[PDB]
Amino acid sequence: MGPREVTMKKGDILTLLNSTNKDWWKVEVNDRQGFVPAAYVKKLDSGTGKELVLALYDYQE
């Protein structure tokens, strides 16, 4: 907890923590938590109970 600089590669599947904001979603990358653009990821249908997103493009601040 406590937003930190996270990055992602196209194809990564991240655990979604908070998608209340339409533009920036909080996710767990490795053992770190941060924000990624909502437009760069897609909510997946499965991994039930746990929320998962697929990274569509690379991202780094």
Curated annotation (Swiss-Prot):
Top-level taxon of origin: Eukaryota
Entry function: Morphologically, spectrin-like proteins appear to be related to spectrin, showing a flexible rod-like structure. They can bind actin but seem to differ in their calmodulin-binding activity. In nonerythroid tissues, spectrins, in association with some other proteins, may play an important role in membrane organization.
Protein localization: Cytoplasm, Cytoskeleton; Cytoplasm, Cell cortex
Family: Belongs to the spectrin family.
Assembly notes: Like erythrocyte spectrin, the spectrin-like proteins are capable of forming dimers which can further associate to tetramers. Interacts with ACP1.
Protein name per the record: Spectrin alpha chain, non-erythrocytic 1
Whole-protein residues included: 983 to 1038 of 2477
Ranges of residues in domain SH3: 3-44
